[PDB]
Design a protein around this ligand. Sequence first.
Ligand SMILES: [Cl-]
Lengths: 294, 294
Amino acid sequence: ALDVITFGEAMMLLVARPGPLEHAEAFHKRTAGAETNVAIGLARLGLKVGWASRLGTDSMGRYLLAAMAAEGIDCSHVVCDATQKTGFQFKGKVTDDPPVEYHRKGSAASHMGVADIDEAWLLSARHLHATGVFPAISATTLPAARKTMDLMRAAGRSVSFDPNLRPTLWATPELMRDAINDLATRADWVLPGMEEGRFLTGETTPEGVARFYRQLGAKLVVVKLGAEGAYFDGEAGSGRVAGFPVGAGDGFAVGVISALLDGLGVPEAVKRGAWIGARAVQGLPTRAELNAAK
Amino acid sequence: ALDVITFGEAMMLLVADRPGPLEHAEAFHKRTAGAETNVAIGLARLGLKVGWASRLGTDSMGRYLLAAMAAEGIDCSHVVCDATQKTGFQFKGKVTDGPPVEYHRKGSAASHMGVADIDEAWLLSARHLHATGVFPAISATTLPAARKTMDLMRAAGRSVSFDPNLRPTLWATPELMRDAINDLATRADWVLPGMEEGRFLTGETTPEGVARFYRQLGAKLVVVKLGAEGAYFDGEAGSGRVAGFPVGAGDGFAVGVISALLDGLGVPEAVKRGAWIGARAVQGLPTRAELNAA
Ligand SMILES: [Cl-]
C-alpha cells in the first residue's frame, strides 16, 4: 500500500535581515521538522510516504498540512485537533549557523502516544523510518516510538533508525544515551554519524560504532564519516564508500532508504546517500536530478 | 510620580504581507497588540508619565514587546519577564477590503497574573488607573486582580477609568461577561462605553439610559461613544453631546478623554479630544505635536 511511514513533529519556521530576533521587522515562512525532511526527500523521489503526527486547527497547522500534501505525502494520519496547538520556531539571518529559537513545549505532536498508533495502517507500509527526534519530544512519545518499531519488526517490515541527537529535548545526556541505544535495539538499519557514535558507544572507530550496533541486533549499520564518505557493516559484509567534494544527514538518510527500497545494493545505496548528503548541504532532489547525475 | 498606570497583556502581532487567507501568506510584519497597551502608547505619546504592569516570556517575542513598549517612554519596571512562561502572539491577515485575528494567547505569562502581582505602593504613586474589559477576561486569576486594582485606587481617592470592552471568546458564558464587566463598573469614576456594548450591558437603547445605568452604579462620569455621531457625556457638572469628526477607534477615544481630564481640561473639550483621536485612528496615535495642530 505504501513504501515508508514516519512519525514526527513539523513546525512552522519563521525566518527573519540579520541581527537579533527581537529587532527583525519581517519573517518568511518555511517548514521545519526532522522526520518530515526525510518524508519530503522520499516523496520527491517518487516513493509513497505517509506521515503520522498531530496539529492544531489553526493557521500554522493548516499551512503545514498543505505544504506536506503538496510534496506528495499521505497526511491521512495527521490528526488535526482544535484543542491543541502547532509548534513554530524562529531563525535569524546568518552572514558568517543561525541560532534557532523553538516554541514547541506542549504542542499537539508532544501529546502523541501509543494510543495514536493505527496498527493496521502502520503495517500497510514496507518500511518505517525512525529518528531520535520524535522519541525525544515528550514523556508520551518515547513509548510511542518504541511500539512503532516493535510492531513493525514483528510484522517482518523494514525498520530504519537514525540516532539523531538533540540534547535540548532530553533531561540528561545519560538519559538520551540510554533511550537512543535502547531504540537501536529495535532497528534493522542504523545510520549513525561518527561523532554521535563516539558519544553513544565510546568507540573511536567506524568499525567500532558498527560492531556495537550489530551486537544490539541490526542487519545493517552505515556510519557517516563526512568528507571521507561512509563506512558500512552488513550481513553481506563491510567496506567504505568515497563520498563527495562540497541537512547532510537527512539527505544521506533519503539516499540509503530510497535505494535499499528500489532494490539496490548496499554500496550503491550508500553512494546515493553520499550524493544527496553532499548535494543538499547547498534542495532535496527529484528522480529527474537523481538520474541525471549518473 | 506617574500620571497613569494600566494592567494588561500585550502580544506580538504578525501581519500578513498580502490579502490571502492566513495559511497562504509567505511573509509577516511585526507590530504590537493589546488593548491596555495601545492606550498606554497614546497617553505616552501625548507626554504623560505612564507605567505598564504585565508578564512576558524572555523569548524573543517577549523581548520585542518589552523594548517596543519602552521606546515609547512607558515605565516598564513592573513588567516581569519570567523565563518559565510564554509570550502571547497573534496573526492578522490584510484586507483588500472587508480582517480576522487569530489569537495565540492561552496559558501565556500575562494570563498567570493575580493579586500577588500588584505592587501597592507603586500603583498609588500614579494619579490615575485605566482599566478595560480585556485584562479581567484573561484567566480566572486576572479578575481578582482587576477588582482589587480598582478598589485600591479608589479608597486612596485616586482616579479610575473604565472602558467596558467586550471580548466574548475570553468569557465562559456571555452572561458572566455581563455580570462581571458591570460589577467592575462598580469601581470606576469614569465609564467609557460604546452604544453597542451599552445596549448589551444595560438593556437600554438610548445613550441617556446607558449613561444613567452607570451613574446609578456610582460613576462620576459616563461618556458614551457614538461612532461618527460623536459622543454623549453624563457627569456631575451636567450632560451634553459632542459632534465628532468625519472620515482601533475606541482606544483613540479613551486616550483622548483620559489625557484631557488629567491635563486639566473640562469634560466637553475632553470628549472632543477623545473624538478627534478616535476619528484619526479610524483612518497612528498622535504626538502632542500632531495634536497641537487644531
Ligand atoms: Cl487585546
